[PDB]
Amino acid sequence: MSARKLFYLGPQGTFTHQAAVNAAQELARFEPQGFDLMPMDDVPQILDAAQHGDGWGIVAWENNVEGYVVPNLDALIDAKDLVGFARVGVNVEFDAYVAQGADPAEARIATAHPHGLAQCKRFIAEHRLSTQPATSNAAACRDLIPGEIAFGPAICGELYDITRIGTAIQDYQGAATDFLVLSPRAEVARLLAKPRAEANVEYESVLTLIPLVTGPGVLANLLDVFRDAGLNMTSFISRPIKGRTGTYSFIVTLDAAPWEERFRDALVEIAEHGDWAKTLAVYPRREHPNPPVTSWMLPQGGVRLDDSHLPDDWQNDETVRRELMW
Amino acid sequence: MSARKLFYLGPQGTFTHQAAVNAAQELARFEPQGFDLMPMDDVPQILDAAQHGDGWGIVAWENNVEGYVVPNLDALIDAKDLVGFARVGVNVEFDAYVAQGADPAEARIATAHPHGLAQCKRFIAEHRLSTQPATSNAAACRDLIPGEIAFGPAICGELYDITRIGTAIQDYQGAATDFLVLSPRAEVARLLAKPRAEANVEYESVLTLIPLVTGPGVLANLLDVFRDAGLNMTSFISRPIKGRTGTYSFIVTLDAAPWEERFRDALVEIAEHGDWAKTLAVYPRREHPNPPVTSWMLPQGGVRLDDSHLPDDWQNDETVRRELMW
Numbered sequence: 001m002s003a004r005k006l007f008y009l010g011p012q013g014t015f016t017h018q019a020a021v022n023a024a025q026e027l028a029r030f031e032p033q034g035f036d037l038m039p040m041d042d043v044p045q046i047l048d049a050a051q052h053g054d055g056w057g058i059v060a061w062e063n064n065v066e067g068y069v070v071p072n073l074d075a076l077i078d079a080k081d082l083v084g085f086a087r088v089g090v091n092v093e094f095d096a097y098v099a100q101g102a103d104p105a106e107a108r109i110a111t112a113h114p115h116g117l118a119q120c121k122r123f124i125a126e127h128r129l130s131t132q133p134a135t136s137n138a139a140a141c142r143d144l145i146p147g148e149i150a151f152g153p154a155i156c157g158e159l160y161d162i163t164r165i166g167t168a169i170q171d172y173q174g175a176a177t178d179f180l181v182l183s184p185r186a187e188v189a190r191l192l193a194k195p196r197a198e199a200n201v202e203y204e205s206v207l208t209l210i211p212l213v214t215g216p217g218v219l220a221n222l223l224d225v226f227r228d229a230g231l232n233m234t235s236f237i238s239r240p241i242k243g244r245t246g247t248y249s250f251i252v253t254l255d256a257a258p259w260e261e262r263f264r265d266a267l268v269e270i271a272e273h274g275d276w277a278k279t280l281a282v283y284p285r286r287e288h289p290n291p292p293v294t295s296w297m298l299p300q301g302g303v304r305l306d307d308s309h310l311p312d313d314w315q316n317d318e319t320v321r322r323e324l325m326w
Numbered sequence: 327m328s329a330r331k332l333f334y335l336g337p338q339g340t341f342t343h344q345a346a347v348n349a350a351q352e353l354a355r356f357e358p359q360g361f362d363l364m365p366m367d368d369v370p371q372i373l374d375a376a377q378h379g380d381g382w383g384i385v386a387w388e389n390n391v392e393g394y395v396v397p398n399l400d401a402l403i404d405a406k407d408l409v410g411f412a413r414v415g416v417n418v419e420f421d422a423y424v425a426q427g428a429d430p431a432e433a434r435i436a437t438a439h440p441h442g443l444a445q446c447k448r449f450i451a452e453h454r455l456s457t458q459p460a461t462s463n464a465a466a467c468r469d470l471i472p473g474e475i476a477f478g479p480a481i482c483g484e485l486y487d488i489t490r491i492g493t494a495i496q497d498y499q500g501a502a503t504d505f506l507v508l509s510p511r512a513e514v515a516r517l518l519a520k521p522r523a524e525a526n527v528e529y530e531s532v533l534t535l536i537p538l539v540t541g542p543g544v545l546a547n548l549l550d551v552f553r554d555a556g557l558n559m560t561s562f563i564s565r566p567i568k569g570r571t572g573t574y575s576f577i578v579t580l581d582a583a584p585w586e587e588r589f590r591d592a593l594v595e596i597a598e599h600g601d602w603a604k605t606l607a608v609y610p611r612r613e614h615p616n617p618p619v620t621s622w623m624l625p626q627g628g629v630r631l632d633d634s635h636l637p638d639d640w641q642n643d644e645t646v647r648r649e650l651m652w
């Protein structure tokens with residue numbers, strides 16, 4: 001009858017804690033009696049407790065500015081019995097805090113994890129603060145005393161007796177981390193019985209593929225399979241297999257559920273070629289902004305030709321030579 | 327007549343400082359009068375000074391455990407006039423240090439950047455140390471006083487009056503970061519005149535490609551071009567174009583120089599399709615370990631069939647259903 005435990009990277013107040021709160025909200029219907037959010041010291045302990053069946057884990061997956069959390073990716077790849085079934089986002093915003101009762105004019109020190117101080121340079125500038133490092137942004141907000149300002153997640157203001165003096169004060173606008181919720185596979189299959197039965201098309205999957213061949217053409221031959229099946233991808237990365245340099249796996253995120261016939265037929269083809277395959281996550285399809293190509297702002301330099309009216313002798317232009325280095 | 331300046335992420339003692347030392351050695355023949363290694367506060371300042379023509383920059387590129395340094399990747403993508411021309415590695419090993427004259431039995435505190443303490447857990451355990459955070463591992467070794475042990479790069483022992491008591495004491499064996507050396511493009515083209523003239527095949531390139539089309543098949547059609555040209559890839563990642571979600575660029579690392587005819591003909595084809603393209607780096611080809619496929623150790627679970635003798639009704643095996651979630 002107990003609350004479903006949701007294990008996240010501690011301590012209390014981290015962005016991963018916020019992710020757990022968000023997850024508990026979106027997943028409320030799966031666990032009517034609610035969730036018990038439990039901080040853990042690290043990610044391997046989270047996976048272990050999830051895989052033992054004590055509850056669900058939530059782990060940072062991808063940030064749009066910093067990329068994948070590669071150790072988490074690698075750990076999920078090699079888990080014996082976990083799969084992702086929800087993907088939740090947390091905007092990376094830092095608030096500024098003082099110890100309750102402390103006067104902000106008297107703060108001379110900014111405290112946060114060094115990566116947090118790096119994201120709040122302007123604020124530190126504008127307030128003439130020195131910097132002191134903390135083990136985490138959250139620990140900084142926990143340990144606040146007068147004469148300091150801590151930078152941390154919005155959630156810290158809920159958890160500790162601290163006074164918010166600044167909201168979303170970080171330099172960069174628009175960074176966000178996505179997190180996956182993880183559970184043993186049989187449990188998830190059951191949770192997915194209805195959409196699987198309804199052949200619901202509104203799902204995304206994350207898949208790892210290892211063609212057991214090397215050399216030119218291996219990835220092209222693989223991806224032709226997804227093309228010919230009409231499967232759209234939204235993220236792709238190559239990784240070594242278990243840190244071994246010179247080995248190659250591929251992790252794809254696609255706009256399909258593995259029960260869809262086109263997906264099924266792709267995987268049959270890939271598996272019958274001998275490639276190793278594993279589905280790492282299946283979760284409801286997020287709605288992607290689709291800014292049109294004609295509105296895409298391209299990076300500086302580079303070569304771009306008008307495909308319907310090509311320039312003459314374009315291959316020898318000095319600027320082309322520079323950008324392509326040929 | 328001066329030393330060539332080499333700008334790296336400060337302060338003195340960082341792994342990036344070690345990378346600069348390594349770079350100065352491998353590149354000694356380009357600058358007979360030697361190098362002046364200059365620490366800078368951040369990467370954008372490094373790129374700026376490189377692009378202004380004050381000297382060369384060196385920036386962290388990819389770590390095998392943590393992946394690409396995505397902000398560095400993105401910054402190079404958008405530079406107006408920089409290209410990489412050397413790729414140097416630094417093994418991630420931490421040494422343990424005490425203030426000169428201090429007795430190691432009396433150390434009660436370990437100091438490092440939190441990511442450094444996280445990589446040296448066992449040592450901290452085995453020595454009954456509490457932990458204190460520092461802004462960087464290097465800063466920890468700089469600021470050493472008795473009763474502390476700092477964890478930092480080998481180079482710290484050269485730069486500060488500190489006594490090494492432990493060598494490569496970190497938990498994980500075998501992590502390494504590669505760094506790129508950057509310079510304006512005309513300068514690099516000149517540096518590459520000989521191998522370009524000799525049509526030297528012993529180079530690798532990093533390339534960013536942006537097909538100006540969306541939907542299924544876009545990447546497959548692109549990569550078919552590299553297949554048909556016999557170009558082998560060793561790394562691949564998708565990225566948003568300038569943080570914009572729903573836009574897509576691709577960054578490939580390949581075993582060819584852009585002057586090679588097969589490479590040239592690939593890029594002609596890609597450019598005449600309308601895709602935007604930019605070469606981010608060209609540098610001597612590193613020798614890749616090529617462990618044979620039959621020796622590849624695969625991750626736990628997953629589906630792998632014997633391609634020459636397939637199992638019967640394999641698509642309905644309970645274990646298959648679990649690993650693929652269909």
Ligand SMILES: O=C(O)C(=O)Cc1ccccc1
Pocket residue numbers: 231232233234235236540541542543544545546564574
């Ligand atoms: O080819 C497709 O499926 C596309 O949508 C392009 C793509 C491919 C892989 C990652 C991101 C975008």
Ligand SMILES: O=C(O)C(=O)Cc1ccccc1
Pocket residue numbers: 214215216217218219220238248557558559560561562
């Ligand atoms: O298809 C090839 O070129 C391969 O070598 C496989 C591959 C592709 C992309 C990144 C790493 C390996």
